[model samples]
Target chain A: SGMEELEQGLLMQPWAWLQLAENSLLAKVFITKQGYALLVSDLQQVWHEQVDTSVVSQRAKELNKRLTAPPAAFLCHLDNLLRPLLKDAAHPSEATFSCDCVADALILRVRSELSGLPFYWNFHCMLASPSLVSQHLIRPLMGMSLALQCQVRELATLLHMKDLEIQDYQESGATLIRDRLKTEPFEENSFLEQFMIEKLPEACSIGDGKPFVMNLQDLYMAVTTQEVQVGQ
Target chain B: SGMEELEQGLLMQPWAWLQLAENSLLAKVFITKQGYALLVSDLQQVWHEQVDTSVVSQRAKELNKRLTAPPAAFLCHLDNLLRPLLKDAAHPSEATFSCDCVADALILRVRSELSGLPFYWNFHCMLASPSLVSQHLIRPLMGMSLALQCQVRELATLLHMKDLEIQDYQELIRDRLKTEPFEENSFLEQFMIEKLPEACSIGDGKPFVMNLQDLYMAVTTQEVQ
Candidate 1:
């Protein structure tokens, strides 16, 4: 009953508040929907506050300035700063100095943000090296984004055109039909044709002016049989 | 009597006239010390003025402008202008456009000017590639000249110092003596004794001084060998 009460209290807190608590490594202070509080100090018992939090907080402010900008700009800033730090860390005198933990932390942060975007999973292999990720990958992606943005603006213009006549609807429809016709047709009497015929008969109909209605099943059979005859 | 008449004509003409006469691909002209001229134009029969001389004279004026400036500046200009030409000449479309003859002409011109200077032979191998010669070798030489010029200025300052008391004449003399003595001394002889003997008398020199000097010589000998 006590464990159930504790779990209920933890679940009542906002997800964002729980994330902030986790990031700050703070002891959990859960408030139940009934306004009862349950304070857990499991993290506090293990945590060692050995490093200067003030210095880290100051650097965090600078990091925030870079992070809030575009990913490419943030990557450039990280590259310019971290490359020299990496070089210094390689020296014999600087055996104790390292930027591995810092790199890992930044990588994790970027990975989380990138995970929400489309191309994130495609760059999984590139993410192994921070230098390669920032220098080679992000810069090219930024350039590609500019080109894609230009194309998107043109699409927006097409969408915003007011007059249907000015849009050349006939030509657009003809092009769509031509493209569809150029593609390989499906099999005859298949489920695809049967489903289309049953749900949307107009899709399978032809304007022959002879009182003739063509089903997808009949059209597909004609195309496939014609292709087989040509092959022979 | 005929030679005397030729001498009179040659003496009346200007020096530039003689130079022009010599440069026109004419047959060899002999002028005696007494200004006797023996004119021969057998080469004139074979030579033809096919190229436009006016265009050449105009381009020569521009060439003179580049020649009057520093070699480094001229080299830089030549490098920038010729590199593109070299690239164009390499193109498949420019099969008939050859810069080999042009490069040979420039190489001859530069070679003449460089003849009087040091490092002439070192650049001979570099002349095969005009781009490499200008961009790599000449660019580095220009940078090296800046450092060498600074050293030359310091040497000038040493030469200019007045009264020679403010200057360390002893150190200067000692360095000169050390350089000369090191070159002349043999491995069997004590180099220190030979070096110090001319500057300071042998008997006047202290036993301790000889031993210390000998120690320096021994160390230097080991290092040199």
Candidate 2:
């Protein structure tokens, strides 16, 4: 259960590529009651850290020895602070973040609020082991392809159903009063042929960070281990 | 040209989880004019092998010592066998595939025909290094997410456009027909209200249509507003 806390948070999580003071850093942060899991990349290398409550408490106390707060308050503050930044790549004026390298590890420092007092926290990120990289990036990426590919199959199914509905109206000897309202039959192969020729080159121009995170947020949430909740 | 071969094959490629002879294996194989690259997994371990023309030629000789064929002919035959298999996820009666473990490596063997003789080739897959894993898996999967996201938007946008035309036609025909025309917003509301209870218990992720409804909730909101 303790291990799963960070793993659940990391699953299907979106990557945030922040243009910080030094350069662009791709990061994923998940903080919960048990611990926090962090994965960060400078495009050349990746670093990860999963810290439990003890370490979090120690870090919180060291950063705010002047102010005392419960671990819940600290994690709550982190959730509030990092969630906003992760939701969008740009940092708010209230919060500032930076990346630093030391020895074999990378640290991402955050300056934000903890109950109206200044709070600082460091994600002591280590070079991600190959297994961690696979767990975070490779497995999730494959699942996204599965989920996204499955999404396309449904869209094409619905599109076919639309054609079937429209065809009934057309065949029933009903003519549209407005000629422009006529719907053409959708040709499946031609649609892909057209998409490959016209839209794919444009679609594959894959570098902007914002549009991707924004557009995919909902679908991204759906795929994290396939949740089937009984109630709201 | 050689360097780009594997990289190009790796781009925007979809994943296939094969129900192979040994449990399930997820694999991607890309062969082109310059070279061939493959990524495979038995669900726990990942393996990759990228071979150039020289190596392909050498391997082809190992597989078929008597057969004389250019590297292109061998590549084309391999493509023909795997292409349709990848598309539909089943092997044709003409050919078959199997998975096995070799010393510190995986060998995905294909038994098919070449030049009127039985042809055999092994993928010679080695444990994927961290960088190879990232290059072959991480980067392309990210691109697929991006590509699929854009396509989803474009397709949904068109579906809404189609809905508009369908409604207008229904409106035109309503002048003569006694049946009442439907409303998109009203249907959306009724659909959500009616389906809420039934949509909740989606056992073991089989509720994919529900996945569409939830996803289309955001997609439709994007359009309606």
Candidate 3:
């Protein structure tokens, strides 16, 4: 039931919440803010484990860096580095083939893209074959993951700024800025507001059967007022 | 020089300005509104030719239909239909390979996703092999193309609604609705406005790009007001 709950919980959160393991073998690691971790293998078996708070905090820092690179640049980097390697394996004239070689090439390309960024990670030889890994795991993973990375990065920065502003207001006892924060209309298209609405149901659903009733306005206030925390 | 100008022209316009040809062999067709067409092949050679305006007009109607389906649905459809076919040629245990077969699979996937959509088109087997096609062409093509497809569809729908509203206003000669049409604040975050800014540069860059310029200017003025 917990596994089912976690799976459901993951669906409600943005894809950016799933973090790749630093040196994972046989499973991909997904860490949550609640200090719980899930290790998913090729067979789709879910193993729940307690994650180190420090590790999760370190990962948050790394994610901030990896995501700071523009999505377009990350994609271009993937294309430039991986194309030739993929082409070689897929080449018509090559009579011999090795899944390990192909997987290694893929791993190398993924590593190269996130080379300088400390936060990004990958799974090592989890899938049985290289082609299977490429098709089922890496391709779709990279596609959706990179697609949302920039948005996540932007939201992270926005929240951090708000947090600092709130702290400054608390220290200075300035009611003007605090009043504007409460009164200002939420930007409908913002990633922060979108993420809040998306995760609100799941957050409220935890340990309670009753459905949570809160509009975007209430949720925005809760978020700004430090009643709700994200990626902390 | 003309090629340089055309390249400059293309940068200024949005991808929507480049219309893909319906039926062509040995070359992929990209036609501009200026009655100019460029047929590009696997070799990346650009051949400029005159295109029939009527054909281009017909293509526009088709593009509307092609881009209608949601992009995620289109992608899933591609994966379901083509994965098995691609697996046959790309089986890891197989010792020998033909780039053509892999390329065919990649092409099939691309073609399937854009099957009904007229705006989407493909290059003929220009690259040397299937692997080359898969890596160099299909991957990048799908990446950027699919990203914009959904936004484009939404923008098209928004414009269609506006057009309908304008028609109704014209029929009734309703001054109130007409004033709202001219005065209503532009939804800056809407896909239509976003796509406009993305494409407006090219729209302005065209030799007789006056219509698009006026449209963009009106939207900008409305937003500012």
The model with the greatest lDDT is: 2
CA-RMSD of model 1: 43.5
Docking class of 3: incorrect
Error of 2 at A90 (Å): 7.3
The residue ranges of model 2 lying beyond 4 angstroms of the native Cα positions read: A12-19, A41-46, A57-73, A88-92, A101-104, A113-119, A127-183, A227-232, B1-19, B30-36, B43-45, B51-124, B170-225
Tell me which residue pairs clash in candidate 1: none
Quote the positional error of residue A133 for candidate 1 in Å.
Answer: 6.5
**TM-score of each candidate's B chain against the true B chain:** 0.17, 0.60, 0.20
TM-score of chain A of 1: 0.17
Model 2 agreement with the true structure over A16-118: per-residue lDDT tens digits: 6565666667777777877888788754467888888888889988877657777767887888777777766455558788888987788888887766778
Global Cα RMSD, each model: 43.5, 7.6, 23.7
TM-score per model over all chains: 0.13, 0.67, 0.20
Interface RMSD of each: 46.0, 7.3, 18.8
Candidate 3's TM-score: 0.20
